[PDB]
Amino acid sequence: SEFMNILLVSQCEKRALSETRRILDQFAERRGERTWQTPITQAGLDTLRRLLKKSARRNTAVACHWIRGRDHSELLWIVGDASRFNAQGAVNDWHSAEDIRLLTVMAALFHDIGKASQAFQAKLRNRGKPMADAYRHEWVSLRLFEAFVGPGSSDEDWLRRLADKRETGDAWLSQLARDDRQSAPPGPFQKSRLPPLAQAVGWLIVSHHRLPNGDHRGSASLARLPAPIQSQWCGARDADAKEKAACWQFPHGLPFASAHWRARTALCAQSMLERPGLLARGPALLHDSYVMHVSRLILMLADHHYSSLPADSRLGDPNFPLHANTDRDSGKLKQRLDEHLLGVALHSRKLAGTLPRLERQLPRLARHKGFTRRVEQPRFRWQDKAYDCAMACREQAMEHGFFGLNLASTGCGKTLANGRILYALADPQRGARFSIALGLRSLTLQTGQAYRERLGLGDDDLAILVGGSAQELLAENSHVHFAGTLEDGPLREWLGGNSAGNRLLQAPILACTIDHLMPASESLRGGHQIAPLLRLMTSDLVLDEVDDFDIDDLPALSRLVHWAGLFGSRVLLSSATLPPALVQGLFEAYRSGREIFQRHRGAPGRATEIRCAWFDEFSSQSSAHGAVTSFSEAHATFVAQRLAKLEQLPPRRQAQLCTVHAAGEARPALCRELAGQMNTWMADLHRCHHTEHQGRRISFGLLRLANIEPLIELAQAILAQGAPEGLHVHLCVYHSRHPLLVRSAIERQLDELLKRSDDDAAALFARPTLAKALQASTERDHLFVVLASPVAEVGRDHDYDWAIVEPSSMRSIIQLAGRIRRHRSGFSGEANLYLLSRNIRSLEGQNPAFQRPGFETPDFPLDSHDLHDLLDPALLARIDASPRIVEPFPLFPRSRLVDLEHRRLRALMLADDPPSSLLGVPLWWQTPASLSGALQTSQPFRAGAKERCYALLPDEDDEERLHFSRYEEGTWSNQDNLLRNLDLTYGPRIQTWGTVNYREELVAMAGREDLDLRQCAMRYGEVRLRENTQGWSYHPYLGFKKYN
Amino acid sequence: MSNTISDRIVARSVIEAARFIQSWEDADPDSLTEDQVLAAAGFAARLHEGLQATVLQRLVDESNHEEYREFKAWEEALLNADGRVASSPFADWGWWYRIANVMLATASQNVGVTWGSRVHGRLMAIFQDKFKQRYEEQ
Amino acid sequence: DPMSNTISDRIVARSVIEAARFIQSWEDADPDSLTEDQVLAAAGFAARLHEGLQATVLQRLVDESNHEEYREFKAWEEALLNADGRVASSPFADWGWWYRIANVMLATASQNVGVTWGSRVHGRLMAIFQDKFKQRY
Ligand SMILES: Nc1ncnc2c1ncn2[C@@H]1O[C@H](COP(=O)(O)OP(=O)(O)O)[C@@H](O)[C@H]1O
Ligand SMILES: [Ca+2]
């Protein structure tokens, strides 16, 4: 296209300036000490920006200006430090840091002290066959540490003794309480045992690999943590073997006999002693979720990184008998015990001191024209209101936290809105960092790329975390697609320089799933919390389509929201269907988090008054709240006004109930008759809602089924029968049980073809796929049809002419309604949405009928599974968000579909007696529960049969042969005995569309990325499947179905 | 009273199940060896873990019915064991008492033999000894 | 555990001794050349499974109201009829009676110890069966 006159000014310094000049001098011409000006292509500019981002350091500061004439100039972008510039061109409060540092370093010095046992030393050089220890090494550490402190001792007592480096000779390990004894001694955390500071150190020691987790789960005991923690909580469920002595031997003795380790421990003990008030802050620290989990973060990451480093002769006594680890590559025992303890301690301090610099040193997104550009189009006018509203409360949100609700109607432009809101809350001088976490199990590349497109960002600014969710840190097959600044990362040393974790944190904007961040609070073992915790601590958070979650996943979401609040993040929920009892519980989770956040960080004592905000297509408003009661009242008020505006919007949908007639009801027979009726309904909907051009008529329809098994059967039946007379049916099967790259490619085609607008018939028919399909057939009537799982409700900007929907829940119904005439104005008034009066489960005689997905439970039953009773007939005529955003009063949880959702939500979110678990979700912030894994265990996230991850792999030897394979543990096994191909039958006048030839797309994916054909399948061709003994049937058009 | 739930956990404990059976098959509880005690402990703990998982994760077709009754009985026992409703994990007809029943049934359906109250007694006595410090605070 | 394999899990739970033997014996093994102890462990467990599964099909041990369970049952039925010479006489054919039994043995192994066995180990189980269950004495 046209050449633009481009100006570049550099405020770079140090080696960054050297690197800037070395790049800009190549592609532009220097016209000052720090200025370039040259005519350039948009392509050449995008290319120049990328290169600049790639080698940018923290000292890089380049501004880019488009000179549009003598009088006018425009700021296009900034790379690096956006301070250094004004509104265009050239011109800490970490109150606990020291306490944290000292705790972490002390814990680090004692963490693997237990590795000094006969058993662990033996295990080190064992060779084979392996088998586990008996007691976990961190548990013996704790009790060694307890033996030194001595029981009933003061904090000054043990510290003054540890600070004295003249001491001593192991007399204190007589007092060692041993758990190999028949009859147990009182656990190290009881009141007459370790003092408070020691308990914090103790907790840190014992919890460095996994959270303690016990069999008693009473709320009272949770309130008393860590007191209850005993040997059975700490991996010593591994019982027995009868040594049981080898774990308690120590010959040679302990790190106390290493002079270097003994010296560094005295300095840390001395430091703790001279720190004003620290000993007295002891008990407050131990019950502070911020202090403990940040310390655990620092410990675990230092431990992770030092473990990977080679032996260091300059560290510890050279003679030292005990080792800590062996080689991973080789098998030889290398890296002494005192060395490792000192190495971890060193890196804990270093990492601790790095944390407060993360705000100033991590890449940010600044002066993005896309978020500042005003909107000329009405229909997205509300985006500008939302932006101004967020700008108007930026200052308060910075000091008080932020809890926002984007309740815009389905189809309004929420993504860009979401981006612009968070952007508004960022420091205008330094710019933004936020993450968009979608409420899907898996994020495809295409859905990630849709975010890029809608936010006007490229892969130098927005990182996509691709895939689903299960010392390598953050999964293994999880790949972060990102091309921006990685080079001069503040945490590059402990994370890899090019690792997923580093990429994840370096990216200004992150796109992922809520599952990808969940481990932040949820993870029970390993360092799976480290990467997403870091993300939470350094970026704001969009929770996108959050209430798509199964109700049983909501307590974990609360834990995560509480943690956003606890670590200084600001939270925006985005969903048209957010119900009162949900936002109420999440607000409280955020509020109680921010309150603790405020004891460390910011001006002390300042009140908890959260900056809350509501946004929708009509208006946006903010106000401050420090109680859930006043928040609830402001929310109820904003909703009430929204209801009035909705209640008076012109209808675009009209629902009608379709009665289904069955037979068997054996699944194949049921799907056959159901397909049979669908042939009539599709014909009816096509006749009413279609587009005509040059004598032909095209319509687009959506068939939504709840579950993939019945969906696949129905697909077979629909293909078997033809189209009805005179009609050509094109079928596209879309669900989550495809290879991930196939699903991405289906979405790519559907997203493109299902873009609509007013008076567009000519462009529509001109689009190649449809142009082709019409030139190929005689028929004048074409139905393009997507048969989809609930995976079509979220993240698809689709405009269908009509839809036939199997009912699962009200959110589902609402979400699908918004996919009908999503882009187009007006409406004939004839029915365009059909709801089966019953769902598959009910037609098969299963009760509860509204579950997997849905809310119906034997404890919360419905008295009729027929939609004729379960909905207000008044609803059919105007499907919008209304029934989800307000609770009805009184509630009929037995008679109404939506009232059940509300009842279930209010019974769970903040109640003291949530169904099943019977432990209140708030115990997460009302108790030190987080010192344990009790709530993550008793209210488990993604409860159910586990999905194991499989792929169609090109053979290691031969690229042209495929094997169905299962991912094990860093390798893929051949599992061809578990895959049966399946041949299909077609009827008259039917074909498929939006399909994908696996091999053709695999080869294409392995072009765009420069990968081996095999490595591309391992990375991008995963499909998640519940283990089934006899395996699956596969067809490229249909994905995988359980094989009996 | 179906045993579908019990079977899925046993089918996931074959090594510990066979070990218990062979070690006890003809044994007499009044004269047990170190290794017999430990064979019983190892199986019961394996079952413990699987069944606890089953309740907490709701691994049950709530639509089944005879299965759902079986599930609710386990839930009841769990909530009477772990402190949520009560704190008596070794009480009659509770959690461990039901674990022992699964162990005697598994021996029966594998090798024909029928253990009775005397075996059950010694199992319960082992489970209190080996597992009381899992629930209590000293 | 899921809500998918209740017929086989019931039988496995009645084959613990033979199941343990297969698993333990075949731990740290080699499929292409095997000890006589091994081939015996793989055979005895496959016979215990044959005995239990045959009995389930013949004695009709299934709740015909479960749909899910009935579909698993029907597939075992369709396999036995293709094995006992009623619909067909091919018990060693792919997707058939012994084929499915080896799949159970593998899934049982994966669920107790978490081994990686797949196609390669499967074909070695099928070779054995074709040998030692050639004709029903
Ligand atoms: N400025 C925009 N114009 C048009 N579409 C947009 C814009 N920004 C985002 N989109 C896409 O359309 C959606 C807007 O409607 P939305 O309410 O999100 O639908 P749903 O609630 O079904 O997800 C966005 O989430 C995004 O997918
Ligand atoms: Ca360790």
Ligand SMILES: [Ca+2]
């Ligand atoms: Ca370590």
